[PDB]
Protein backbone atom coordinates (compact mmCIF):
# COMPACT_ATOMS: atom_id res chain seq x y z
CA UNK A 1 0.00 0.00 0.00
CA UNK A 2 1.10 3.58 -0.53
CA UNK A 3 -0.06 6.85 0.95
CA UNK A 4 0.87 9.77 -1.30
CA UNK A 5 1.61 13.23 0.09
CA UNK A 6 2.04 11.67 3.53
CA UNK A 7 3.45 13.56 6.53
CA UNK A 8 7.24 13.61 6.17
CA UNK A 9 7.86 11.31 9.15
CA UNK A 10 5.76 8.46 7.76
CA UNK A 11 7.54 8.75 4.42
CA UNK A 12 10.91 8.77 6.20
CA UNK A 13 10.32 5.50 8.03
CA UNK A 14 9.63 3.71 4.74
CA UNK A 15 12.58 5.11 2.81
CA UNK A 16 16.36 4.70 2.83
CA UNK A 17 16.72 8.43 2.05
CA UNK A 18 15.20 11.73 3.22
CA UNK A 19 13.08 13.93 0.96
CA UNK A 20 10.39 11.48 -0.20
CA UNK A 21 6.66 12.07 0.23
CA UNK A 22 5.09 8.64 -0.08
CA UNK A 23 4.54 6.30 2.87
CA UNK A 24 4.88 2.67 1.73
CA UNK A 25 3.49 -0.01 4.03
CA UNK A 26 1.93 -3.46 4.20
CA UNK A 27 -1.88 -3.46 4.04
CA UNK A 28 -2.10 -5.49 7.28
CA UNK A 29 -1.30 -2.17 8.95
CA UNK A 30 -1.00 -3.43 12.53
CA UNK A 31 -4.45 -5.05 12.60
CA UNK A 32 -4.78 -7.37 15.58
CA UNK A 33 -2.24 -5.42 17.64
CA UNK A 34 -3.00 -3.00 20.49
CA UNK A 35 -1.21 0.14 21.59
CA UNK A 36 -1.70 1.83 24.95
CA UNK A 37 -0.97 5.58 24.85
CA UNK A 38 -0.17 6.66 28.39
CA UNK A 39 -0.55 10.40 28.27
CA UNK A 40 -3.18 13.20 28.63
CA UNK A 41 -5.87 10.97 27.13
CA UNK A 42 -7.26 10.53 23.62
CA UNK A 43 -10.16 12.27 21.89
CA UNK A 44 -11.62 8.92 20.87
CA UNK A 45 -14.38 10.59 18.87
CA UNK A 46 -11.92 12.08 16.36
CA UNK A 47 -12.96 10.86 12.88
CA UNK A 48 -9.34 9.97 12.15
CA UNK A 49 -9.47 7.10 14.66
CA UNK A 50 -12.41 5.45 12.86
CA UNK A 51 -13.80 4.05 16.11
CA UNK A 52 -10.54 2.19 16.86
CA UNK A 53 -9.68 4.32 19.90
CA UNK A 54 -11.05 3.93 23.41
CA UNK A 55 -10.26 5.46 26.81
CA UNK A 56 -9.83 2.69 29.38
CA UNK A 57 -8.60 4.52 32.47
CA UNK A 58 -8.19 7.99 33.92
CA UNK A 59 -6.56 9.18 37.11
CA UNK A 60 -8.39 12.49 37.03
CA UNK A 61 -11.97 13.83 37.17
CA UNK A 62 -12.61 13.10 33.49
CA UNK A 63 -11.26 10.80 30.79
CA UNK A 64 -11.32 13.65 28.26
CA UNK A 65 -8.08 14.90 26.68
CA UNK A 66 -8.33 18.61 27.50
CA UNK A 67 -4.74 19.14 26.37
CA UNK A 68 -4.21 17.72 22.86
CA UNK A 69 -0.84 16.09 23.39
CA UNK A 70 -2.17 12.57 23.97
CA UNK A 71 -4.46 12.80 20.97
CA UNK A 72 -1.48 13.94 18.88
CA UNK A 73 0.69 11.00 19.93
CA UNK A 74 -2.15 8.55 19.46
CA UNK A 75 -2.68 9.90 15.95
CA UNK A 76 0.93 9.22 15.02
CA UNK A 77 0.56 5.66 16.28
CA UNK A 78 -2.61 4.81 14.43
CA UNK A 79 -4.84 7.44 12.88
CA UNK A 80 -5.90 6.91 9.25
CA UNK A 81 -4.01 9.82 7.72
CA UNK A 82 -1.22 10.47 10.19
CA UNK A 83 -0.54 7.06 11.72
CA UNK A 84 2.13 4.42 11.22
CA UNK A 85 -0.10 1.44 12.05
CA UNK A 86 -3.41 2.45 10.48
CA UNK A 87 -5.50 -0.50 11.66
CA UNK A 88 -4.20 -0.97 15.18
CA UNK A 89 -6.41 -0.68 18.29
CA UNK A 90 -5.65 2.28 20.55
CA UNK A 91 -6.25 2.40 24.30
CA UNK A 92 -5.90 5.64 26.22
CA UNK A 93 -4.64 5.87 29.79
CA UNK A 94 -4.80 9.40 31.24
CA UNK A 95 -1.94 9.80 33.72
CA UNK A 96 -1.26 13.46 32.83
CA UNK A 97 -3.61 16.34 33.63
CA UNK A 98 -4.88 18.85 31.07
CA UNK A 99 -1.77 20.98 31.64
CA UNK A 100 0.30 17.96 30.66
CA UNK A 101 1.78 17.40 34.09
CA UNK A 102 1.57 14.47 36.46
CA UNK A 103 3.02 13.01 39.63
CA UNK A 104 5.36 10.05 39.45
CA UNK A 105 3.08 7.93 41.64
CA UNK A 106 0.27 8.37 39.10
CA UNK A 107 2.51 7.57 36.14
CA UNK A 108 3.70 4.41 37.91
CA UNK A 109 0.12 3.35 38.68
CA UNK A 110 -0.71 3.88 35.01
CA UNK A 111 2.09 1.54 33.91
CA UNK A 112 1.11 -1.17 36.40
CA UNK A 113 -2.47 -0.77 35.22
CA UNK A 114 -1.53 -1.54 31.61
CA UNK A 115 0.48 -4.61 32.64
CA UNK A 116 -2.72 -6.06 34.12
CA UNK A 117 -5.35 -4.64 31.77
CA UNK A 118 -3.81 -6.21 28.66
CA UNK A 119 -4.81 -9.57 30.08
CA UNK A 120 -8.47 -8.58 29.59
CA UNK A 121 -8.09 -7.55 25.94
CA UNK A 122 -8.10 -9.34 22.63
CA UNK A 123 -4.71 -8.42 21.14
CA UNK A 124 -3.63 -11.57 19.27
CA UNK A 125 -0.65 -9.92 17.53
CA UNK A 126 0.76 -8.27 20.64
CA UNK A 127 0.74 -5.26 22.92
CA UNK A 128 2.68 -1.99 22.80
CA UNK A 129 2.80 0.96 25.20
CA UNK A 130 3.85 4.46 24.15
CA UNK A 131 5.14 6.81 26.85
CA UNK A 132 5.81 10.31 25.56
CA UNK A 133 6.63 11.71 28.97
CA UNK A 134 9.37 11.94 31.54
CA UNK A 135 11.14 13.92 34.20
CA UNK A 136 14.25 13.74 36.38
CA UNK A 137 15.78 10.40 37.31
CA UNK A 138 13.70 8.12 39.51
CA UNK A 139 14.59 4.51 40.21
CA UNK A 140 10.89 3.87 40.99
CA UNK A 141 9.73 5.14 37.62
CA UNK A 142 12.45 3.12 35.88
CA UNK A 143 11.38 0.03 37.79
CA UNK A 144 7.75 0.50 36.69
CA UNK A 145 8.79 0.73 33.04
CA UNK A 146 10.93 -2.39 33.48
CA UNK A 147 7.97 -4.24 34.99
CA UNK A 148 5.70 -3.23 32.13
CA UNK A 149 8.26 -4.50 29.60
CA UNK A 150 8.82 -7.72 31.56
CA UNK A 151 5.07 -8.38 31.57
CA UNK A 152 5.20 -8.82 27.78
CA UNK A 153 4.50 -5.30 26.49
CA UNK A 154 6.75 -3.51 24.02
CA UNK A 155 7.59 -0.29 25.87
CA UNK A 156 8.69 2.77 23.92
CA UNK A 157 9.66 5.93 25.83
CA UNK A 158 10.80 9.40 24.82
CA UNK A 159 14.44 10.29 25.39
CA UNK A 160 13.47 13.81 26.55
CA UNK A 161 13.99 17.32 25.16
CA UNK A 162 16.80 18.91 27.18
CA UNK A 163 19.58 18.43 24.61
CA UNK A 164 21.40 16.43 27.32
CA UNK A 165 22.40 12.90 28.25
CA UNK A 166 19.21 10.89 28.80
CA UNK A 167 20.93 9.02 31.68
CA UNK A 168 19.55 11.70 33.99
CA UNK A 169 15.91 11.27 33.01
CA UNK A 170 13.18 8.68 33.58
CA UNK A 171 11.81 6.49 32.30
CA UNK A 172 14.24 7.25 29.43
CA UNK A 173 17.21 5.91 31.40
CA UNK A 174 15.75 2.43 32.04
CA UNK A 175 17.89 0.17 29.81
CA UNK A 176 15.26 -2.55 29.33
CA UNK A 177 12.79 -0.36 27.40
CA UNK A 178 13.11 1.26 23.95
CA UNK A 179 14.36 4.84 24.37
CA UNK A 180 13.62 7.08 21.39
CA UNK A 181 15.46 10.21 20.23
CA UNK A 182 14.19 12.66 17.61
CA UNK A 183 15.32 13.67 14.12
CA UNK A 184 14.20 16.35 11.63
CA UNK A 185 13.33 16.11 7.93
CA UNK A 186 16.92 16.79 6.89
CA UNK A 187 18.21 13.80 8.88
CA UNK A 188 19.72 15.93 11.65
CA UNK A 189 19.29 15.08 15.31
CA UNK A 190 16.51 17.41 16.47
CA UNK A 191 18.07 20.39 18.26
CA UNK A 192 16.19 19.57 21.47
CA UNK A 193 16.68 15.79 21.47
CA UNK A 194 18.41 14.13 24.40
CA UNK A 195 21.21 11.79 23.46
CA UNK A 196 23.47 9.27 25.15
CA UNK A 197 24.39 5.61 25.37
CA UNK A 198 20.91 4.72 26.65
CA UNK A 199 19.19 5.71 23.40
CA UNK A 200 18.11 2.73 21.32
CA UNK A 201 16.83 4.40 18.18
CA UNK A 202 15.79 7.69 16.55
CA UNK A 203 12.49 8.56 14.90
CA UNK A 204 11.02 11.66 13.23
CA UNK A 205 10.25 14.28 15.89
CA UNK A 206 10.48 17.78 14.40
CA UNK A 207 7.37 19.36 12.81
CA UNK A 208 5.08 16.33 13.01
CA UNK A 209 1.51 16.74 11.75
CA UNK A 210 -1.11 14.70 13.59
CA UNK A 211 -4.55 14.77 15.24
CA UNK A 212 -5.51 17.37 17.85
CA UNK A 213 -8.52 17.99 20.08
CA UNK A 214 -11.71 19.55 18.73
CA UNK A 215 -11.44 17.22 15.73
CA UNK A 216 -8.51 19.19 14.34
CA UNK A 217 -4.84 18.71 13.42
CA UNK A 218 -1.59 20.49 14.14
CA UNK A 219 2.16 20.22 13.81
CA UNK A 220 4.31 20.06 16.94
CA UNK A 221 7.85 18.93 17.76
CA UNK A 222 9.48 16.71 20.40
CA UNK A 223 10.91 13.32 21.30
CA UNK A 224 7.29 12.96 22.30
CA UNK A 225 6.51 12.90 18.59
CA UNK A 226 9.26 10.40 17.74
CA UNK A 227 8.16 7.83 20.32
CA UNK A 228 4.74 6.97 18.76
CA UNK A 229 6.48 6.50 15.37
CA UNK A 230 8.50 3.71 16.99
CA UNK A 231 5.52 2.37 18.98
CA UNK A 232 3.45 2.26 15.78
CA UNK A 233 6.32 0.62 13.89
CA UNK A 234 6.58 -2.07 16.57
CA UNK A 235 2.84 -2.80 16.36
CA UNK A 236 3.15 -3.01 12.59
CA UNK A 237 6.11 -5.45 12.72
CA UNK A 238 4.45 -7.67 15.35
CA UNK A 239 1.34 -7.97 13.20
CA UNK A 240 3.57 -9.05 10.32
CA UNK A 241 5.11 -11.64 12.64
CA UNK A 242 8.64 -10.35 12.21
CA UNK A 243 9.32 -9.86 15.91
CA UNK A 244 7.80 -10.12 19.40
CA UNK A 245 7.30 -7.63 22.22
CA UNK A 246 10.43 -8.81 24.01
CA UNK A 247 12.66 -8.30 21.01
CA UNK A 248 11.02 -5.55 18.94
CA UNK A 249 13.39 -2.76 20.02
CA UNK A 250 16.40 -4.90 19.12
CA UNK A 251 14.76 -5.88 15.83
CA UNK A 252 14.04 -2.25 14.98
CA UNK A 253 17.65 -1.26 15.77
CA UNK A 254 19.00 -4.19 13.72
CA UNK A 255 16.94 -3.28 10.65
CA UNK A 256 17.32 0.49 10.97
CA UNK A 257 18.86 2.90 8.53
CA UNK A 258 22.41 3.19 9.88
CA UNK A 259 24.73 6.21 9.81
CA UNK A 260 22.35 8.60 8.00
CA UNK A 261 21.89 11.09 10.84
CA UNK A 262 24.05 14.14 11.46
CA UNK A 263 24.91 15.89 14.75
CA UNK A 264 24.97 12.62 16.67
CA UNK A 265 27.43 12.86 19.58
CA UNK A 266 30.08 10.16 19.86
CA UNK A 267 28.66 7.33 21.98
CA UNK A 268 25.08 7.71 20.74
CA UNK A 269 23.60 5.26 18.23
CA UNK A 270 23.22 6.54 14.68
CA UNK A 271 20.10 4.49 13.85
CA UNK A 272 16.82 5.67 12.29
CA UNK A 273 13.62 3.62 12.46
CA UNK A 274 12.86 1.94 9.11
CA UNK A 275 10.11 -0.48 8.05
CA UNK A 276 12.03 -2.29 5.28
CA UNK A 277 8.94 -2.48 3.13
CA UNK A 278 9.34 -4.02 -0.30
CA UNK A 279 6.36 -4.21 -2.69
Amino acid sequence: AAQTNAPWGLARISSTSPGTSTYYYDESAGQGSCVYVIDTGIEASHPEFEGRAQMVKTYYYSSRDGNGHGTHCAGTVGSRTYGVAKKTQLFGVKVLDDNGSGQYSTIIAGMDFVASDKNNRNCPKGVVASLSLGGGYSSSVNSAAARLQSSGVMVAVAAGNNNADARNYSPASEPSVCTVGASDRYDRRSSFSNYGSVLDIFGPGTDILSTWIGGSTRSISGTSMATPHVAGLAAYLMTLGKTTAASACRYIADTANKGDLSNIPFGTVNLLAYNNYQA
Binding site: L96, G100, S101, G102, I107, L133, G134, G222, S224
Partner: peptide, 4 residues
Protein backbone atom coordinates in the same frame (compact mmCIF):
# COMPACT_ATOMS: atom_id res chain seq x y z
CA UNK B 1 5.58 15.60 35.44
CA UNK B 2 5.74 17.07 32.01
CA UNK B 3 4.64 19.25 29.32
CA UNK B 4 6.89 17.18 27.04
Amino acid sequence: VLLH
